[model samples]
Target: NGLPSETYITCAEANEMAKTDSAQVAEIVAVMGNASVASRDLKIEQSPELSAKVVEKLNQVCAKDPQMLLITAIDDTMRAIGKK
Candidate 1:
C-alpha cells in the first residue's frame, strides 16, 4: 500500500565512513562503532575501527530519529531495500 523504505549501511561501507570521517580508529569507535553491538544477529563483524564505522553509518544512514536532511536513515534503509 505504501512506498518502500531506505537507510541501510553494510559493515564495509560504515568502515569507510569511519576512516574518512574520524581519521583515528579509536575516536570512530568511541562515537559510533562497537564490536559488541555488531556481534548481534546482524553478524556485523569488524575491527574496533570498523565496528565503530558500522555504528556511525547506522546513525548517519538508518537513523530512527529524524533530522534536517531527509527521512531518518532507518526509513531510508527500508526504502532502498524496497525500491519500486
Candidate 2:
C-alpha cells in the first residue's frame, strides 16, 4: 500500500470553501451523525428545510480540497452525545 494525496489549506480557506459548496464536512457528518437519527434527541432538531439544506451543501464539496474537507469532517463530529 502507498500513501494518499495531500493538500494544504488554512482554516479561513476551509470556511470559505464550505460556504461556497465544499460540503464534505456536512456530508460525512450528516451520514455519520444521523445513522441513528438522533439530532432530535440531541436537541439539534430543525425543519425539513434545514435538513435539506445541510444535505445539499454537502453534495457540493470540492474534489481538489480533500485535506480541508477531511479535517473538517473529522473535527466536526468528534464527541458523541451521552458519551465521549
Candidate 3:
C-alpha cells in the first residue's frame, strides 16, 4: 500500500487533539468519513471535541496515506479486536 497505517487512539489521546483547531478534527473526520457515510454502524460516540482528537491522531499517524487516515484508524481498531 502507498499509504501508511497507524494505530488507534484512546480516550486520553482524544483529549489532547481537542485542544487544536476545529478543521483539524473535521479534516480527520473527512478522511474516515466514508465509514460513517456508507453505514450507520460506526459513529463518533465521544464528544465532538474529543472525537476530533481521536480522528486527529489517526490522521497524524497516517503519514503515507493522509487522505485515508481514518480508514487506517478503523483497520487498527478492528485488528485490536479478534476477527470472527
Candidate 4:
C-alpha cells in the first residue's frame, strides 16, 4: 500500500505554528510542540487569547502532519497577503 496518510512533524514546526518567531529559541529546546486539540481541551498555560485570524488560517488545513501543514499554510498565507 502507499505510505501512511499521516506523518509526523518536528517540534520546530509545531513551535512556529504555535506562535510567531520569538527571540527565545533556546527556551523550547526541551519541549514538544503541538497543534489541534478538541475545543474543550486547549490549555491556557501562559498563553494569551488565540487569534481568530490565525485560528481560521489553521482551521482550513487537513494534513498528514497537521502542525506542519498549519505552519506552512500560515506562512504561505502571510506571504500572499504581504503580512510577513
Candidate 5:
C-alpha cells in the first residue's frame, strides 16, 4: 500500500483565501471544529452561530500571525470558550 497522507490548511493559506472565499474558510473552520471536539472531548454543541464565532476568532488571531497553525488557533479559541 501507498503511504498515507493528509492535507492541512495553514494560517497563511486560510488568511489568503478568507479575503475572496468565505465558504472555503467556513468549511475549513468546520473541519477544525470537528477535529477540536473529537480530540479534546469538549462538550460544546456545534451550530452555525458557533462556527461563525470560531471563524471570527480565527481571523482575528491568524491575521496577526500568518505562521501560526490553524489547529492552534482553533485550540486557543476552544480554550477561551471554556472547552478545555
Candidate 6:
C-alpha cells in the first residue's frame, strides 16, 4: 500500500540502471528514503541532497555484490552516514 513505483528493486536491477539510466537510480533512492522514514529506522531528515548521497553510496556497494537486496544496500548507506 505504501509502495513507490520503484519499490522492491534489487541491487542487480539498480546496478543495471546505474549503467544506463540514472533516473531509475534516483527513483530507487526516493523509494529507499520513503521506506526509511516510514520504518523510523533512520532518524535524519530526508532531503534531496541526502537522497543523492545515498544513491552514490548505493552505486559503490551494489557494484561489488549485486545479489544483495536493495533495501540492505540502503541500510548500509544509512549506517555509513551515521543516520541510524
Candidate 5 colliding pairs: none
**Would you list the rank order by lDDT, best first?**
5, 6, 3, 2, 1, 4
lDDT of each: 0.40, 0.42, 0.46, 0.36, 0.66, 0.66
Model 2, 43-67: lDDT tens digits are 5553545434544433344333443
Give a tens-digit lDDT track for model 5, residues 20-82: 987777776777676676566655566788667777767778778875666667777767765
Kindly give the stretch of ten consecutive residues in candidate 4 with the minimal lDDT sum.
Answer: 30-39
TM for every model, in the order presented, reads 0.23, 0.29, 0.31, 0.28, 0.63, 0.57
Q: What global local distance difference test value does model 4 have?
A: 0.36
Candidate 3: deviation at residue 57, Å? Answer: 0.7
Model 6 alpha-carbon drift over 4 Å, by segment: 1-8, 18-21, 34-43, 82-84
Model 6 TM-score, 2 decimals: 0.57
Backbone atom clashes (below 3 Å) for every candidate: 19, 0, 1, 0, 0, 0
Q: Give me the overall lDDT of model 3.
A: 0.46
Best by lDDT: 5
Q: Model 3: clashing residue pairs?
A: 4-65
Local error of candidate 3 at residue 34 (angstroms): 12
Indicate which candidate wins on TM-score.
5
* lDDT pick, better of 2 and 6: 6
The Cα RMSD of model 2 versus the native structure comes to 8.2
Tens digits of per-residue lDDT, candidate 4, 1-84, equal: 132232133333544544664323223321112222212234523232334334444444433344454335445434444432
Name the candidate, 1 or 2, with the larger TM-score value: 2
Ranking by TM-score: 5, 6, 3, 2, 4, 1
User: Which of the predicted structures, 2 or 5, would earn the higher lDDT when compared with the native?
Assistant: 5
Point out where model 3 deviates above 4 Å.
Answer: 1-44, 64-69, 77-84
**Which stretch of 10 consecutive residues in model 5 shows the poorest summed lDDT?**
1-10
Candidate 2 lDDT at 83 equals: 51
On the 0 to 100 scale, the lDDT of residue 34 in model 5 is 63
